[PDB]
Paper text:
The [name] ([name]) gene product of [name] is an N-acetylglucosamine-l-phosphate uridyltransferase ([name]). [name], a bifunctional enzyme, catalyzes the final two steps (reactions 1 and 2 below) in the de novo biosynthesis of UDP-GlcNAc from acetyl-CoA, glucosamine-1-phosphate and UTP, While the N-terminal domain of [name] catalyzes uridyltransferase activity (reaction 2 above), acetyltransferase activity (reaction 1 above) at the C-terminal domain requires the formation of a bio­logical trimer. UDP-GlcNAc is an essential precursor for the biosynthesis of peptidoglycan and lipopolysaccharide, which are constituents of the bacterial cell wall. [name] consists of two domains: an N-terminal uridyltransferase domain with an α/β-like fold and a C-terminal acetyltransferase domain that forms a left-handed parallel β-helix structure (LβH) with the shape of an equilateral triangular prism consisting of ten turns.
[name] crystals in the ligand-free state were grown in VDX plates (Hampton Research) by the hanging-drop vapour-diffusion method at 277 K against 1 ml reservoir solution consisting of 25 mM MES pH 6.5, 1.8 M ammonium sulfate, 5% glycerol, 5 mM MgCl2. The crystals belonged to the cubic space group I432, with unit-cell parameters a = b = c = 285.7 Å, and contained one molecule per asymmetric unit. The [name] crystals belonged to space group I432 (No. 211) and contained one molecule per asymmetric unit with a solvent content of ∼82%. With one molecule per asymmetric unit, the monomers from three neighbouring asymmetric units related by the crystal threefold formed a biological trimer. Although this is the first report of the structure of [name] determined in a cubic crystal form, the trimeric arrangement here is similar to that observed for other [name] structures determined in hexagonal (H3, H32, P6322) space groups. Although [name] consists of 495 amino acids, a model could only be built for residues 1–472. The extended C-­terminus present in [name] [name] was not well defined in the electron-density map. The residues 149–150, 154–158, 164–177 and 200–206 that are part of the N-terminal active site are not well defined in the electron-density maps as the active site is devoid of bound ligands. The biological trimer found in the current structure of [name] is similar to that in the [name] homologues, except that the active-site residues 398–403 are disordered. Therefore, it appears that the tail-to-tail arrangement of trimers in the cubic form results in a sparse packing in the cubic crystal form of [name].
Residue numbers in the entry:
A (entry chain A), B (entry chain A), C (entry chain A): 1 to 145, 152 to 165, 167, 179 to 198, 208 to 397, 405 to 473
């Protein structure tokens, strides 16, 4: 388990986000599963400090996901700080210290909300470097392709090798420096006082990269995804095209699985072992069993059994539950319906609010009109209209082109189709030409 | 407004295009909306010179889009020059001067047709540099990863830092040099005469890049698209994957919109504000209202209302007009049909040549056979066959599995479905086994 | 024709593949059409040596595709070597020499099975370099962004410019060095003996790149595909997005064809001239005629005629045979069925195990239930159920919503649909409100 000593972490999410050009606040923008605020707060919760406070601008819209949805899921209390007037980064940290007690002793960690790739390891290295030299200020730094340097390689100040914006302060030195505006000046005053100033270098520049516009958001969204796709490949996932395959956080994929280009695994998608995920597939919070094929499928909040063939051209809606060895073929839509083990729903069908038994069959061009219940080993005919509610017994049959409105007994044929009538030489009388010649 | 002084621009599109390996001429190849000829002529029309002439090889196929479709849209007359025999670039410019009067005074700008990324700003900088030093010849140059240089950094000649192929001549010097073969020799003779030769450097190398093969066409097609996608992101468009998102010229996207990977916005596509464009979506000349969702849709020449849900698995055909809050669900095809405000067409449907009123409903597995008119607040049943023409009154109903051939009165049920008949113990007699046990 | 002198090639595919994290052996992993073993053995068969032997670890699963499927297709006998205990690369080559006669005279070529991009040209250059200097050992080398060097630029030894792992030995020197463990030591002993050691440099580093994990497999899968897509573009294929377009080996594309992003041409796909391949299209072993449009199609083992419109939203299954000018529209599924010349199957249809004549028409929302035969110039109505077997004569008709069970005579109407019945003011009595007001 990874954890620091006595530390307090301040999150700075008080920026207006004018460069984003959005009505929805900058820090609440989602990438690869979670929002930018969620990415920062999760990394700090991994190490778990003594205090965690977030500074906010327009707070009321941001105070809903924070504390309510974030702190309750993580399992620890997070405080909220309010900035009165946007003056600078130094004033924002001062507003974060107001929630902290006046007689606090532990270290202060300064972090930004618009840094989604910042993980626990980078934050743990900052605190470890801070304790080693016993410095008043420890700053994370990285190299690019704005840290000022003298002549004999020493740290001085920052002039928008580069400054990341992530800091580690001693509260005894931070309170004294802010009393005498930007946060970059705090380091300059501490240097003038003769305090130890240290710079910890991060080799991976993408971790401490900030987001100002939607270009930089997509630059890091493609970056964060690249690490996840590669991590599954090393674990045992055959990804054909990593550039088009999108995998969010918490998404788990099984051993020896093939994922084809254009696939988006979103939310909390679970994939079993030896699965063939086809091209152009979108899944969100969908559980997939072992050996199941998911080709060309648009799924959301669904469950697929072991060795089940889903697709192509399948649309799944919240509440879909396909069993083992069950088949969902082409042009099939399922909404809030439970499908049994070995049941095949192949051609041009819609199953809405229904329960189907084991090893049954649904006829082509059949729809469930809106609870309907179908038994086991039931072969329903093609173009079968289901007017809810209908209870079908086990082992029953249905004719081709049958409108079912009432209950069907176990082992009984349901028919309403009109018998075929042929009129010879009708084309020769009705049609003057075209398909009439020759007959 | 941007405009030069007294200038005449010559476009060189007389190349055979053997490297392209195409029956269709090189310069007529389209990328990101417009053709290569259209990209060049639009950039020159932005600044608008006194004269514009295009030199052509096989003219008759190229003279149709030029003058007829190009000059009429821009609003200014363009002349056509014909090359008798492909001798070189110097002879091609001489053929361009033949359309110009013998007593012309203004400057001559030389440009190539196979340079699609060449914009107005690069051409405006060339003329401004040409007027400043009062040079006889001004040439655009760029750096690569074939300009000849002496020893004290001076311009001499060109030996297939690099030559772009875009020139600015003084007509008094151009007419005199061509009288005494390639266009690169003209600069060499002017240098020997003692005339001022100037080179204007372009920092962006992609702007003056030429196309010889279909590889270079795709290299610049991915380049031109990269700038457009990024421009929308800075404006206020959340693009998930810029590499798979294709946006043509004239295509406008609204504020705070989400576009998912695999989306192609082609032609003159318009997107409103706060729209959710789903994965694998193709739209060409389709107008989309504010807050509308377009997921997994193949659209061409259509209109989508405000807050309307289109998709997934929807195919739109020229003449489709969906109103506000209207829903086009899964596996739906619409051809030349007007759909009212709040009308839902959800499952496995085809609406061809029909007019539907406000807040109506279309049953699942129903098709419009080929003008049909549906009223407002009309709930048509599932598997409803529409034999054109049918006029349905406001507030009417239709049964499940009904073939409608005649007009339906306002507030009237249309039924032709056969009633359900159940035969008990049919499976036990007809089938020897399988679903018979147990019943 | 390219061919070496007297040479024997040993393939080393005895690695366990623990880094792959797969139940299926490393060398049997497929990329861009063929497996890694198939890619190596095809390149050696192009030049065709006197002897070819493959060393294996767990042989019984790998001995099935090898010799049986590989040697029979190429047309020459390949031997199988078995490794008793994984000791090293030097022991693996010694196990390869056991299949060779004790009095063999020709050269020995050492190659790895996990090198898919290794072509015939790289192997031909190795043997040509080996014969020129008459060296005992000739090794292929490349530059990266582990060959040991002295001071005056000479070859010594290898310390996991770089070592590729591909060798060329003289059998008189190879047998003597292995008698006195890794294969890298063999070069070191030969250098100590005073034998000539030569290094042939390969400018293209991707050719001799090895695969250990699924990341490197995808790194070379995207690399190999990039060369193929570019090769078609130079030949005469307009590819919009090369990054998303996947083209396997043996796949041939015609002249002046347009391929849209998200297309996967797999197996032995054939494309005619002037074809428009739409976005999100997957084809495997599918033949496409000249001028045919394949948009948004999931095809496998099918045939498309000249100038035939397939798509969008079409799913093709093994046995599909569409003729010339035939149309397969939106939401159509075809399984093991022959479709005639000029036959249109447009909306929401399934054609399973059927034969349709020339210039016929299939109604919307119609399915073929399971051999069915349809004649020429036959216009079947919408929602037509086909209960196999049904023989339809030439020029026959079918009503809208007709269940066909028996044979239809040439030029005869088939009807089973119930006539429309209208009940006026039904909504006013049955429904208390909603669509009732106003009527």
């Amino acid at each position: 388990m990874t954890f620091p000593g006595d530390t307090a972490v301040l999150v700075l999410a008080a920026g207006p986000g004018t460069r984003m050009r959005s009505d929805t606040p900058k820090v609440l923008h989602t990438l690869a599963g979670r929002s930018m605020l969620s990415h920062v707060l999760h990394a700090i919760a991994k190490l778990a400090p003594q205090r965690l406070i977030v500074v906010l601008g327009h707070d009321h819209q941001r105070i809903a996901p924070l504390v309510g949805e974030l702190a309750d899921t993580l399992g620890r209390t997070i405080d909220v700080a309010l900035q009165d007037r946007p003056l600078g980064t130094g004033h924002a940290v001062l507003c974060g210290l107001s929630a902290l007690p006046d007689d606090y002793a532990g270290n202060v960690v300064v972090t930004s909300g618009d840094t989604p790739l910042l993980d626990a390891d980078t934050l743990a290295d900052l605190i470890a470097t801070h304790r080693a030299v016993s410095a008043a200020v420890t700053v994370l730094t990285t190299t690019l392709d704005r840290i000022l340097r003298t002549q004999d390689h020493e740290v001085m100040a920052i002039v928008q090798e580069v400054n990341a914006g992530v800091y580690a302060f001693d509260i005894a030195a931070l309170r004294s420096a802010l009393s005498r505006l930007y946060l970059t000046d705090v380091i300059a005053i501490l240097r003038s006082d003769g305090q130890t100033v240290h710079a910890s270098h991060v080799d991976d520049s993408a971790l401490v990269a900030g987001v100002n516009n939607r270009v930089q958001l997509a630059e890091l969204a493609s970056e964060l995804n690249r690490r996840v796709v590669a991590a599954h490949q090393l674990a045992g996932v055959t990804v054909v095209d990593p550039a088009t395959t999108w995998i969010d956080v918490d998404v788990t994929i099984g051993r020896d699985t093939v994922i084809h280009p254009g696939t988006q695994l979103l939310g909390r998608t679970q994939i079993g072992g030896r699965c063939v995920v086809g091209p152009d597939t979108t899944l969100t919070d969908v559980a997939v069993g072992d050996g199941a094929s998911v080709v060309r499928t648009h799924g959301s909040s669904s469950s697929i059994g072991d060795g089940a063939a889903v697709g192509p051209f399948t649309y799944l809606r919240p509440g879909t539950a396909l069993g083992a060895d069950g088949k969902l073929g082409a042009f099939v839509e399922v909404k809030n319906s439970t499908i049994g083990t070995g049941t095949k729903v192949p051609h041009l069908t819609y199953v809405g609010d229904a329960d189907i038994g084991e090893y049954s069959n649904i006829g082509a061009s059949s729809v469930f009109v809106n609870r309907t219940t179908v038994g086991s080993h039931v072969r329903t005919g093609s173009d079968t209209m289901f007017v809810a509610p209908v209870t079908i017994g086990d082992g029953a049959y249905t004719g081709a082109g049958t409108v079912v409105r009432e209950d069907v007994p176990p082992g009984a044929l349901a028919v309403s189709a009109g018998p075929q009538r042929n009129i010879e030489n009708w084309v020769q009388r009705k049609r003057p030409g075209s398909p009439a010649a020759q007959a």
